Amino acid sequence: RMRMRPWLEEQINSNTIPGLKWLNKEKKIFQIPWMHAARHGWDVEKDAPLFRNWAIHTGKHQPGIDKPDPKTWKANFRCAMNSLPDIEEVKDRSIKKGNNAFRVYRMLP
Amino acid sequence: RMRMRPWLEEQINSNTIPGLKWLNKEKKIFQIPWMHAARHGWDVEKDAPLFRNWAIHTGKHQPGIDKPDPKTWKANFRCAMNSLPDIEEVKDRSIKKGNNAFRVYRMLP
DNA sequence: AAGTGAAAGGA
DNA sequence: TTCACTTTCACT
Ligand SMILES: [K+]
Ligand SMILES: [K+]
Numbered sequence: 001r002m003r004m005r006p007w008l009e010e011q012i013n014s015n016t017i018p019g020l021k022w023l024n025k026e027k028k029i030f031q032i033p034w035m036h037a038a039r040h041g042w043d044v045e046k047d048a049p050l051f052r053n054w055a056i057h058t059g060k061h062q063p064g065i066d067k068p069d070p071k072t073w074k075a076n077f078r079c080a081m082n083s084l085p086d087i088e089e090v091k092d093r094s095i096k097k098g099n100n101a102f103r104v105y106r107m108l109p
Numbered sequence: 110r111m112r113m114r115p116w117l118e119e120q121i122n123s124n125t126i127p128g129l130k131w132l133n134k135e136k137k138i139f140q141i142p143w144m145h146a147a148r149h150g151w152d153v154e155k156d157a158p159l160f161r162n163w164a165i166h167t168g169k170h171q172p173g174i175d176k177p178d179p180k181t182w183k184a185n186f187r188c189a190m191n192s193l194p195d196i197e198e199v200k201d202r203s204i205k206k207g208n209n210a211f212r213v214y215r216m217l218p
Numbered sequence: 219a220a221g222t223g224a225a226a227g228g229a
Numbered sequence: 230t231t232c233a234c235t236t237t238c239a240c241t
Contacts, residue, residue, distance in 0.1 A: 180219085
């Protein structure tokens with residue numbers, strides 16, 4: 001029932017997602033790990049936990065019952081992020097290419 | 110105004126809606142064409158006539174006056190179907206994906 | 219973009 | 230729950 005933004009803040013603040021941290025907590029600028037699933041070094045446990053968590057949280061994935069679908073978890077998460085009116089991407093800082101790729105977002109006050 | 114259940118029965122019986130037919134008339138089980146409007150092959154006259162009629166019936170669309178809005182017609186129809194007490198969806202046969210997407214419902218006795 | 223469940227929402 | 234759907238919201 002918890003909407004994406006407050007849920008996301010809780011995810012960042014919990015430090016339980018590798019790579020998910022605030023770049024500037026004050027201005028609410030944070031970064032999300034965004035490594036390509038085709039790139040060597042990618043691992044479901046290291047790179048998709050945040051996407052999986054959103055899927056579990058929204059009933060789209062039931063651990064043990066549903067077959068892991070990282071591609072959909074990521075696409076669903078991105079689309080949901082795109083639709084949020086209070087969170088926008090800071091593209092000049094994002095680097096969604098190469099190893100340890102990531103995206104930077106700022107939560108609108 | 111005629112309610113949705115007897116209205117729907119009339120539509121199915123009129124044999125004027127492409128694809129809208131009883132799969133088992135005695136048990137009141139029928140199928141409604143449910144092709145995704147973005148899929149290639151979708152045409153308003155072929156895939157959205159039923160949704161359009163519910164829109165016209167309920168004052169939500171005046172041909173010639175209102176600009177066609179198949180997206181809303183479908184959403185309105187589905188939401189009205191979801192609320193109906195005596196009409197349930199047979200999920201086990203509602204092949205929603207593919208070339209010929211459809212939904213199966215059953216009017217409860 | 220088209221689609222959806224859930225739940226707030228004229229006669 | 231006035232009733233029988235209808236519209237808005239937040240996200241395949
Ligand atoms: K956004
Ligand atoms: K129903």
